[PDB]
Amino acid sequence: PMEKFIKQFSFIALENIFRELPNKITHSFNDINDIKPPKLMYPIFYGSYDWHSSVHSHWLLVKILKDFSHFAPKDEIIKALDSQFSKEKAEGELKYLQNPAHKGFERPYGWGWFLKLTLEINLLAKENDKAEIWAKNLEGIADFFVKEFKEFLPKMDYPIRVGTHFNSSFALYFALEYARFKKDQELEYCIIQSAKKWFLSDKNMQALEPCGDEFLSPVLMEAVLLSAVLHKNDFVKFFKAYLPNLEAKEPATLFTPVSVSDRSDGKIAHLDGLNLSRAWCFKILSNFCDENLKILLRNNATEHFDKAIAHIEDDYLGSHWLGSFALLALDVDIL
Amino acid sequence: PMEKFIKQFSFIALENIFRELPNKITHSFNDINDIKPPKLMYPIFYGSYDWHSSVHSHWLLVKILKDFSHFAPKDEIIKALDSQFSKEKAEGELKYLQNPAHKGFERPYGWGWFLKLTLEINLLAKENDKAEIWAKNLEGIADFFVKEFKEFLPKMDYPIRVGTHFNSSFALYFALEYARFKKDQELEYCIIQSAKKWFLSDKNMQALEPCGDEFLSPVLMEAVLLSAVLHKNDFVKFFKAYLPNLEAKEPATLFTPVSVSDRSDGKIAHLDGLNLSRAWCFKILSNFCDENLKILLRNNATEHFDKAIAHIEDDYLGSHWLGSFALLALDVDIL
């Protein structure tokens, strides 16, 4: 069952990381000469349509290598990642990141996904010596993003709730996993304090969702971050007041997989990812529920997943990223 | 009182529209040679930090020329606009827009602001012979955006609510003004039908605002669009059920000017614009209210405006755009 998915995910992500065109850059500069093709600006992450999608397509391959290598073109993936994760190319990425004219680049979606990639590489490095070299070569970029989080989070009086790549909860969820693995107590504290400051008074959520270009659910992603930030007992109480009518399938929009009118439009194509990431969030949250609601949410997750899984290769505007959310949804630890 | 502001805004905008650096592009391409400095990609709108801010800095200058010329450096503005709005440069912008590899560029914020610019030029062309020529030279670009709107709105099953440049209500508010001036009945119908479909069931808004990078209020901007879409008596009934506790200043966030922790960060700097755009929206909405709520919202608007107006020149990350929102708020007809 996973066999078909892993083969498909492998093919997609391997094509993504090397595919140069089409591409979209979001690039600030104060020097007219600092306008170059992505291949030169981003020596590793130039493919997969944009920088952050290339990062998590690399993550998808690392995750497949760590946990699903029997289903995957293992040798091809290892050769591909080896030529990508070199010291010189990583120094090129760090050079772009550390240039003051590029301040704010990829905040926070690329930051969180990069820490998730670094985390997955370090976990693979527990058994694979090549991944220990990859982890060493990418350490400087990871340290850059950790520092940027520590510098920026204290400035955030307010969260960013929208279900696009600016979503605060998504990026901090991954940064928190990274922080706990690295035992970065200061990053962990910064994230926990920020989440509590922003979200602890949220209750009886309206959930005006989805919006036309969202690939994340504002209310679910926030709950998922808080499921890692709060103590279990505290989270269960918070969650019951947060969405108090879930057992009646309310708010109804969360139990209705979203419609996708045109997969050839880059923004509307995000809504396929919403059905996938809703499935992912529902599975995570199901582990904090009593048995009846647990199964209800997992059934809901499967209905959302099934509405999107068949379309992840319809268009490169989907296939350059949807595989990562499909695997995230599939791989949640069911407890 | 307006005198200081108009001379200030003119001073700011004339520097903006010709200032090349720093700059930020959001640029998609399917040809590796299609990566050029903004001055070549956008022969008119290469300045003022980014394409859409350049467009509405041009609007600010046109608006000043039309309605505040006694306070303005008219000869300098006319000379600047004359060299900007040439047939050759407009054809260059249109060439970029019509390239299929650039599909979706600047949707919808740049679209609405360009139609607002075109509207103001066409109004100025009733009295100024040079604006007649500018309007002819920009007509192809306006026609392009009108066509892209008519093509895309039927695909939007869901609105975009976030208070950033993806905000549907902001862009459609300006596009609707343009449509009514041009007597484009189809564009008007598209907008009205979209707004009704997206928003008519919204009631008792939670208003989890602001978020950290917003320069628009989701709930207010939506009400402002509906104030132009619905008949007055329908809007009055809708608005009362929409924010039922406004007369008791609830939700409290709408009566609290937002905090701006760091004006040197491009995203946090948006929060200065939010205080200004809230003031603008409150003034518009006050004209639809009974005397009690009218007075409350107008006092609230003044406090929001006063919290931001002094900071609009603190940093280029603000001055490349804040003047336009200051003028919008100052220019609302109090009825």
XYZ file of C-alpha atoms in Angstrom:
670
model
C 0.000 0.000 0.000
C 2.794 2.374 0.965
C 4.784 0.723 -1.833
C 2.904 2.499 -4.643
C 3.047 5.850 -2.782
C 6.776 5.671 -1.989
C 7.664 4.877 -5.621
C 5.516 7.767 -6.813
C 6.864 10.165 -4.174
C 10.442 9.205 -5.125
C 9.902 9.848 -8.831
C 8.264 13.226 -8.158
C 10.840 14.502 -5.668
C 13.797 13.277 -7.751
C 12.428 15.140 -10.769
C 11.679 18.206 -8.599
C 15.085 18.778 -7.090
C 16.826 18.983 -10.489
C 14.074 20.556 -12.596
C 15.172 24.102 -13.413
C 12.087 25.549 -15.168
C 9.536 26.882 -14.652
C 10.592 28.749 -11.523
C 9.499 31.611 -9.291
C 11.847 33.760 -7.245
C 11.008 36.122 -4.399
C 14.208 38.116 -4.256
C 15.192 41.407 -2.643
C 18.421 43.216 -3.548
C 20.280 46.519 -3.236
C 22.823 45.799 -5.987
C 21.660 45.595 -9.598
C 24.224 42.814 -10.237
C 22.552 40.587 -7.596
C 19.962 39.283 -10.078
C 21.054 35.835 -11.275
C 19.401 32.566 -12.321
C 18.336 30.445 -9.319
C 21.010 27.866 -10.146
C 23.666 30.446 -9.226
C 21.820 32.153 -6.355
C 20.771 28.820 -4.773
C 23.414 26.159 -5.579
C 21.375 23.416 -3.860
C 17.768 24.596 -3.817
C 17.330 26.002 -7.335
C 14.768 23.441 -8.544
C 11.256 22.315 -7.628
C 9.738 25.682 -8.728
C 10.931 27.699 -5.694
C 13.446 27.618 -2.837
C 11.172 26.346 -0.052
C 9.582 23.644 -2.234
C 13.040 22.376 -3.197
C 13.956 22.224 0.496
C 11.034 20.008 1.430
C 11.319 17.856 -1.707
C 14.821 17.101 -0.389
C 13.215 16.335 2.989
C 10.808 13.921 1.266
C 13.754 11.989 -0.227
C 15.640 11.911 3.091
C 12.523 10.627 4.881
C 12.023 7.944 2.210
C 15.668 6.915 2.599
C 15.353 6.695 6.395
C 12.011 4.935 6.764
C 10.968 3.509 3.387
C 14.165 2.548 1.543
C 12.901 -0.970 0.659
C 10.166 0.666 -1.467
C 12.396 3.268 -3.057
C 15.166 3.621 -5.688
C 17.587 3.761 -2.780
C 20.857 3.893 -4.717
C 19.667 6.621 -7.073
C 18.450 8.760 -4.148
C 21.747 8.369 -2.278
C 23.736 9.454 -5.353
C 21.398 12.434 -5.922
C 21.525 13.659 -2.295
C 25.310 13.164 -2.181
C 25.858 15.484 -5.109
C 23.425 18.049 -3.655
C 24.638 18.218 -0.045
C 28.265 19.218 -0.655
C 30.166 21.681 1.513
C 30.797 24.137 -1.321
C 27.163 24.234 -2.430
C 26.011 24.654 1.167
C 28.488 27.529 1.571
C 26.850 29.099 -1.501
C 23.389 28.891 0.067
C 24.706 30.358 3.328
C 26.368 33.204 1.418
C 22.993 34.213 -0.025
C 21.290 33.909 3.374
C 23.892 35.971 5.251
C 23.884 38.861 2.743
C 22.117 41.758 4.563
C 20.301 42.718 1.343
C 18.432 39.377 1.598
C 17.221 39.886 5.187
C 13.852 38.210 5.751
C 14.247 35.734 2.848
C 11.929 32.704 3.203
C 10.661 33.744 6.660
C 9.264 31.531 8.188
C 8.195 28.721 5.815
C 11.655 28.011 4.369
C 13.190 28.338 7.840
C 10.893 25.735 9.356
C 11.181 23.360 6.432
C 14.966 23.710 6.451
C 15.100 22.760 10.126
C 12.779 19.828 9.356
C 15.153 18.696 6.579
C 18.166 19.095 8.907
C 16.340 17.162 11.635
C 15.511 14.292 9.252
C 19.118 14.171 8.006
C 20.472 14.011 11.568
C 18.037 11.202 12.381
C 19.183 9.320 9.264
C 22.774 9.948 10.359
C 22.180 7.636 13.324
C 22.498 4.706 10.892
C 23.978 6.166 7.669
C 27.501 7.609 7.556
C 26.871 9.608 4.395
C 24.041 11.454 6.137
C 26.434 12.463 8.929
C 28.477 14.293 6.281
C 25.302 15.859 4.852
C 24.362 16.957 8.368
C 27.804 18.498 8.910
C 27.675 20.338 5.569
C 24.203 21.825 6.233
C 24.896 22.747 9.870
C 25.828 26.360 9.065
C 22.537 27.001 7.281
C 20.588 25.428 10.142
C 22.480 27.575 12.685
C 21.651 30.648 10.600
C 17.923 29.918 10.738
C 18.015 29.130 14.480
C 19.650 32.509 15.090
C 17.137 34.281 12.842
C 14.234 32.720 14.789
C 15.768 33.840 18.091
C 16.203 37.355 16.736
C 12.735 37.689 15.146
C 10.307 35.906 17.499
C 10.650 38.484 20.369
C 9.554 41.167 17.880
C 6.259 39.386 17.104
C 3.489 40.999 19.125
C 1.013 39.085 16.958
C 0.937 35.687 15.227
C 0.373 35.119 11.560
C -2.707 32.910 11.312
C -3.332 32.663 7.532
C -3.106 29.149 6.029
C -0.339 29.983 3.527
C 3.419 29.817 3.812
C 3.471 32.781 6.229
C 1.611 30.641 8.844
C 3.461 30.981 12.171
C 2.250 27.699 13.653
C 3.472 25.498 10.790
C 7.030 26.837 10.823
C 7.304 26.861 14.623
C 5.977 23.281 14.865
C 8.957 22.099 12.822
C 11.412 24.462 14.503
C 10.265 23.052 17.867
C 10.959 19.450 16.775
C 14.411 20.551 15.662
C 15.004 22.460 18.885
C 14.168 19.482 21.103
C 16.345 17.095 19.072
C 19.296 19.512 19.178
C 18.604 20.310 22.853
C 18.488 24.008 21.938
C 16.722 24.993 25.152
C 16.693 28.690 24.250
C 15.015 28.131 20.873
C 12.521 25.808 22.565
C 11.683 28.404 25.225
C 11.316 31.184 22.628
C 8.835 29.102 20.645
C 6.843 27.973 23.678
C 6.598 31.544 25.086
C 5.574 32.979 21.713
C 2.889 30.350 21.116
C 1.430 30.850 24.597
C 1.496 34.651 24.289
C -0.313 34.566 20.940
C -2.805 31.751 21.324
C -3.671 30.880 24.916
C -6.841 32.991 24.974
C -8.268 31.499 21.752
C -11.569 29.670 22.343
C -14.730 28.629 20.468
C -13.095 29.213 17.094
C -15.219 30.502 14.185
C -13.037 28.781 11.480
C -13.892 30.892 8.423
C -12.133 28.347 6.225
C -10.917 27.701 3.672
C -9.619 30.762 1.875
C -8.919 30.563 -1.831
C -5.124 30.054 -1.723
C -4.637 28.217 1.579
C -2.848 24.893 1.848
C -3.097 24.898 5.666
C -5.979 25.189 8.094
C -5.474 28.175 10.437
C -7.423 26.561 13.304
C -5.943 23.053 12.933
C -2.333 24.163 12.457
C -2.551 26.339 15.581
C -3.991 23.417 17.558
C -1.207 21.157 16.279
C 1.490 23.600 17.436
C -0.201 23.870 20.836
C -0.380 20.061 21.074
C 3.439 20.171 21.170
C 3.753 23.379 23.235
C 1.349 22.730 26.125
C 1.434 19.888 28.622
C -0.964 17.123 27.613
C -3.496 17.736 30.400
C -3.468 21.477 29.655
C -3.799 20.882 25.907
C -6.780 18.547 26.280
C -8.621 21.196 28.312
C -7.612 23.927 25.852
C -8.652 21.816 22.840
C -12.110 21.063 24.282
C -12.797 24.797 24.662
C -11.092 25.575 21.327
C -13.337 23.483 19.017
C -16.079 22.364 21.412
C -18.423 20.880 18.793
C -16.039 18.547 16.914
C -18.010 15.456 17.987
C -21.013 16.887 16.108
C -18.790 17.470 13.030
C -18.859 21.226 13.628
C -17.737 23.617 12.279
C -19.036 21.837 9.184
C -16.309 23.190 6.895
C -13.665 21.090 8.696
C -15.613 17.903 7.845
C -16.121 18.885 4.176
C -13.097 18.306 1.908
C -12.501 21.511 -0.018
C -13.257 21.984 -3.720
C -10.458 22.666 -6.205
C -11.793 24.522 -9.240
C -8.607 24.676 -11.359
C -5.394 22.755 -10.688
C -3.583 24.620 -13.462
C -3.751 27.845 -11.397
C -0.885 28.071 -8.924
C -2.948 29.576 -6.090
C -6.078 27.415 -6.398
C -3.809 24.366 -6.661
C -2.934 25.030 -3.007
C -6.377 23.689 -2.028
C -5.311 20.113 -2.892
C -2.562 20.571 -0.315
C -5.216 21.772 2.127
C -7.072 18.473 1.890
C -3.744 16.676 2.492
C -2.578 18.898 5.370
C -6.024 18.768 7.014
C -5.688 14.960 6.972
C -2.239 15.301 8.550
C -3.452 17.712 11.263
C -6.527 15.596 12.026
C -4.404 12.473 12.542
C -2.042 14.322 14.888
C -4.936 15.733 16.901
C -6.766 12.381 16.955
C -4.099 11.018 19.339
C -5.208 13.531 22.013
C -8.899 12.557 21.846
C -11.151 10.001 23.461
C -11.826 6.885 21.410
C -15.022 8.032 19.688
C -13.684 11.405 18.560
C -10.347 9.756 17.707
C -11.922 7.522 15.054
C -14.191 10.317 13.852
C -11.183 12.542 13.132
C -9.231 9.689 11.498
C -12.190 8.849 9.272
C -12.387 12.552 8.384
C -8.653 12.571 7.617
C -9.015 9.632 5.236
C -11.915 11.303 3.410
C -9.786 14.442 2.926
C -6.688 12.463 1.855
C -8.662 10.431 -0.720
C -10.037 13.646 -2.298
C -6.515 14.892 -3.165
C -4.152 11.917 -3.466
C -5.108 11.103 -7.084
C -4.283 14.643 -8.325
C -0.736 15.233 -7.066
C 0.737 14.706 -10.552
C -1.937 16.499 -12.594
C 0.268 19.576 -13.011
C 3.746 20.691 -12.029
C 2.065 23.502 -10.050
C 0.965 20.642 -7.787
C 3.658 18.010 -8.196
C 6.471 20.413 -7.292
C 5.278 20.198 -3.648
C 2.156 18.075 -2.965
C 4.092 14.826 -2.416
C 5.571 16.129 0.844
C 2.152 16.731 2.372
C 0.854 13.385 1.111
C 3.669 11.585 2.945
C 3.217 13.766 6.051
C -0.445 12.738 6.140
C 0.398 9.070 5.553
C 3.171 8.830 8.151
C 1.507 10.172 11.342
C 2.080 7.898 14.346
C -1.341 6.442 15.164
C -1.690 5.954 18.936
C -3.724 70.890 7.525
C -3.901 69.049 4.194
C -1.246 71.483 2.947
C 1.612 69.987 4.956
C 0.501 66.451 4.004
C 0.124 66.988 0.249
C 3.488 68.722 -0.015
C 4.910 65.873 2.087
C 3.291 63.113 -0.013
C 4.365 64.781 -3.317
C 7.921 65.065 -2.010
C 7.938 61.373 -1.025
C 6.274 59.925 -4.145
C 8.434 61.802 -6.664
C 11.556 60.275 -5.109
C 9.891 56.838 -4.919
C 8.885 56.336 -8.522
C 12.461 56.892 -9.803
C 14.362 55.181 -6.954
C 15.646 51.845 -8.271
C 17.212 50.328 -5.115
C 16.562 48.634 -2.818
C 13.977 46.509 -4.610
C 12.086 43.232 -4.299
C 10.703 41.128 -7.150
C 8.222 38.251 -7.231
C 8.971 36.912 -10.675
C 8.114 33.644 -12.401
C 9.756 32.523 -15.628
C 10.156 29.617 -18.036
C 13.205 31.052 -19.826
C 16.497 31.485 -17.997
C 17.161 34.687 -19.979
C 13.912 36.169 -18.591
C 15.689 37.372 -15.435
C 16.485 41.092 -15.794
C 16.670 44.138 -13.511
C 13.266 45.703 -12.770
C 14.120 48.728 -14.910
C 14.055 46.438 -17.980
C 11.218 44.117 -16.951
C 8.959 46.983 -15.780
C 9.801 50.065 -17.903
C 7.353 52.236 -15.901
C 6.902 50.617 -12.498
C 10.478 49.598 -11.615
C 10.845 51.962 -8.642
C 9.339 52.466 -5.192
C 10.672 49.092 -3.921
C 8.210 46.873 -5.811
C 5.796 46.864 -8.772
C 2.519 47.389 -6.900
C 3.930 50.109 -4.610
C 5.193 51.944 -7.671
C 1.722 51.743 -9.238
C 0.038 53.311 -6.282
C 2.758 55.945 -5.760
C 1.871 57.002 -9.309
C -1.793 57.049 -8.227
C -0.878 59.288 -5.274
C 0.779 61.774 -7.638
C -2.171 61.679 -10.059
C -4.639 62.147 -7.198
C -2.589 65.101 -5.889
C -2.493 66.634 -9.373
C -6.247 66.288 -9.772
C -7.550 67.310 -6.357
C -4.733 69.148 -4.561
C -2.734 70.899 -7.306
C -2.637 74.235 -5.454
C -0.469 72.463 -2.831
C 1.664 70.526 -5.259
C 4.772 70.843 -7.438
C 2.574 70.593 -10.528
C 5.292 71.210 -13.123
C 7.554 68.518 -11.655
C 4.692 65.985 -11.360
C 3.486 66.559 -14.917
C 7.028 66.253 -16.282
C 7.596 63.036 -14.296
C 4.292 61.469 -15.350
C 4.822 62.531 -18.989
C 8.106 60.625 -19.232
C 6.659 57.645 -17.319
C 3.357 57.151 -19.189
C 4.683 56.890 -22.732
C 3.258 54.537 -25.344
C 6.570 52.638 -25.624
C 7.003 52.058 -21.871
C 3.364 50.995 -21.449
C 3.782 48.474 -24.294
C 6.784 47.130 -22.386
C 4.753 46.602 -19.202
C 1.970 44.975 -21.234
C 4.502 42.686 -22.907
C 5.565 41.428 -19.478
C 1.959 40.990 -18.360
C 0.839 39.103 -21.487
C 3.719 36.606 -21.378
C 2.152 33.240 -20.337
C 5.174 32.523 -18.151
C 4.082 35.502 -15.976
C 0.473 34.341 -15.485
C -0.924 35.429 -12.117
C 1.625 38.227 -11.661
C 0.457 40.795 -9.078
C -3.006 39.236 -8.641
C -5.077 40.891 -7.287
C -3.405 43.775 -5.390
C -1.489 45.158 -8.352
C -4.579 44.629 -10.523
C -6.882 46.709 -8.338
C -4.328 49.452 -7.744
C -3.630 49.733 -11.487
C -7.352 50.064 -12.207
C -7.532 52.710 -9.432
C -4.600 54.529 -11.070
C -6.337 54.322 -14.463
C -9.596 55.612 -13.003
C -7.831 58.621 -11.464
C -6.005 59.350 -14.744
C -9.271 59.161 -16.648
C -10.885 61.565 -14.168
C -7.914 63.946 -14.510
C -8.181 63.676 -18.341
C -11.484 65.585 -18.182
C -9.445 68.732 -17.331
C -5.822 68.032 -18.322
C -4.872 67.355 -21.936
C -1.725 65.472 -21.010
C -3.710 63.044 -18.867
C -5.798 62.249 -21.960
C -2.612 60.904 -23.542
C -1.572 58.992 -20.399
C -5.009 57.335 -20.300
C -4.726 56.253 -23.940
C -1.238 54.862 -23.352
C -2.313 52.834 -20.284
C -5.613 51.546 -21.713
C -4.166 48.234 -22.936
C -2.840 47.433 -19.461
C -6.189 48.272 -17.849
C -8.008 46.130 -20.452
C -5.626 43.293 -19.627
C -6.427 43.396 -15.916
C -10.169 43.692 -16.578
C -9.958 40.555 -18.749
C -7.872 38.669 -16.158
C -10.455 39.535 -13.455
C -13.386 38.307 -15.560
C -11.511 35.089 -16.276
C -10.411 34.403 -12.705
C -13.350 35.436 -10.468
C -15.599 32.537 -11.688
C -12.893 30.140 -10.450
C -12.957 31.512 -6.886
C -15.158 29.228 -4.810
C -13.623 30.907 -1.746
C -12.566 34.481 -0.920
C -9.145 35.494 0.330
C -9.675 37.222 3.675
C -6.137 37.858 4.981
C -5.256 41.512 5.570
C -2.319 41.555 3.138
C -2.017 42.227 -0.550
C -3.844 38.985 -1.381
C -7.003 40.501 0.231
C -9.900 39.996 -2.178
C -12.051 42.831 -0.834
C -9.423 45.559 -1.249
C -8.691 44.771 -4.901
C -12.353 44.260 -5.775
C -13.356 47.548 -4.085
C -11.117 49.451 -6.529
C -11.969 47.210 -9.490
C -15.653 47.861 -8.813
C -15.114 51.638 -8.849
C -13.291 51.265 -12.166
C -16.080 49.081 -13.590
C -18.785 51.581 -12.648
C -16.859 54.464 -14.194
C -16.259 52.495 -17.390
C -19.832 51.121 -17.483
C -18.332 47.608 -17.710
C -21.520 45.864 -16.600
C -19.960 42.396 -16.762
C -17.058 43.294 -14.473
C -19.496 44.932 -12.034
C -21.758 41.862 -12.085
C -18.811 39.483 -11.546
C -17.651 41.376 -8.466
C -21.113 41.755 -6.943
C -21.926 38.082 -7.449
C -18.548 36.961 -6.067
C -18.878 39.153 -2.958
C -22.436 37.942 -2.292
C -21.467 34.275 -2.713
C -18.415 34.600 -0.459
C -19.630 36.823 2.337
C -23.415 37.014 2.777
C -23.547 34.317 5.452
C -20.873 35.994 7.598
C -22.277 37.071 10.989
C -20.985 37.878 14.501
C -17.338 38.120 13.448
C -14.642 36.950 15.868
C -12.031 39.375 14.372
C -8.844 37.606 15.449
C -6.873 40.682 14.378
C -4.333 41.896 13.824
C -1.889 39.405 12.486
C 1.814 40.308 12.435
C 2.187 41.357 8.768
C -1.224 42.876 7.968
C -1.821 46.352 6.579
C -5.571 45.739 6.108
C -8.262 44.600 8.539
C -10.011 41.435 7.262
C -13.388 42.278 8.849
C -13.441 45.979 7.949
C -12.214 45.536 4.379
C -14.909 42.923 3.776
C -17.586 45.286 5.170
C -16.311 48.121 2.992
C -16.621 45.997 -0.166
C -20.152 44.942 0.825
C -21.053 48.572 1.494
C -20.511 49.161 -2.248
C -22.054 45.832 -3.373
C -25.319 45.769 -1.388
C -28.207 48.211 -1.379
C -27.963 50.462 1.675
C -30.855 48.953 3.617
C -29.503 45.456 2.910
C -26.032 46.565 4.044
C -27.317 48.189 7.240
C -29.098 44.967 8.239
C -26.062 42.875 7.272
C -23.597 45.113 9.121
C -25.633 45.070 12.351
C -25.590 41.252 12.410
C -21.947 41.250 11.213
C -20.437 43.167 14.163
C -23.324 43.257 16.641
C -21.361 44.685 19.576
C -19.567 47.584 17.812
C -21.530 50.171 19.812
C -20.023 48.588 22.955
C -16.565 48.744 21.252
C -16.413 44.967 20.772
C -14.433 43.202 19.540
C -11.993 45.337 21.553
C -9.161 44.925 19.014
C -11.012 47.119 16.506
C -10.862 50.048 18.988
C -7.185 49.551 19.876
C -4.591 51.053 17.497
C -2.100 48.282 16.800
C 1.476 48.195 18.097
C 4.487 48.392 15.766
C 7.489 46.781 17.447
C 10.084 47.399 14.693
C 9.679 49.770 11.733
C 12.929 48.538 10.198
C 11.354 45.133 9.463
C 9.451 45.108 6.188
C 6.660 42.847 7.462
C 6.161 44.444 10.883
C 6.228 47.854 9.147
C 2.893 46.852 7.580
C 1.278 47.446 10.962
C 1.716 51.221 10.524
C -0.315 50.928 7.334
C -2.967 48.957 9.226
C -3.631 51.876 11.576
C -4.037 54.090 8.496
C -6.224 51.651 6.536
C -8.372 51.027 9.626
C -8.893 54.802 9.801
C -9.841 54.807 6.118
C -12.275 51.882 6.566
C -13.837 53.309 9.728
C -14.542 56.618 7.960
C -16.174 54.854 4.997
C -18.253 52.666 7.286
C -19.314 55.592 9.489
C -21.273 57.047 6.546
C -23.596 53.992 6.686
C -24.317 54.123 10.412
C -26.777 55.869 12.658
C -25.490 58.898 14.563
C -24.276 56.992 17.645
C -22.058 54.474 15.879
C -21.057 57.106 13.302
C -19.486 59.220 16.063
C -17.771 56.226 17.710
C -16.166 55.056 14.476
C -15.019 58.556 13.480
C -13.374 59.110 16.863
C -11.814 55.652 16.537
C -10.572 56.501 13.040
C -8.836 59.648 14.295
C -7.020 57.765 17.057
C -5.815 55.165 14.558
C -4.662 57.816 12.078
C -2.851 59.830 14.760
C -0.997 56.719 15.946
C 0.624 56.244 12.532
C 0.865 59.535 10.617
C 4.076 60.709 12.316
C 6.003 57.564 11.354
C 5.433 57.435 7.596
C 8.995 58.700 6.853
C 10.911 56.734 9.515
C 12.199 54.165 7.000
C 12.067 53.496 3.260
C 10.264 50.243 4.175
C 7.390 52.549 5.136
C 7.833 55.668 3.013
C 7.799 53.748 -0.257
C 4.065 53.128 0.303
C 2.521 54.562 3.487
C 1.668 57.972 1.935
C -1.004 56.433 -0.301
C -2.868 54.954 2.674
C -2.481 58.218 4.571
C -4.109 60.068 1.661
C -6.880 57.455 1.366
C -7.795 57.947 5.033
C -7.575 61.747 4.830
C -9.703 61.903 1.683
C -12.914 60.106 2.796
C -16.009 62.286 2.390
C -17.654 62.730 5.803
C -21.427 62.576 5.075
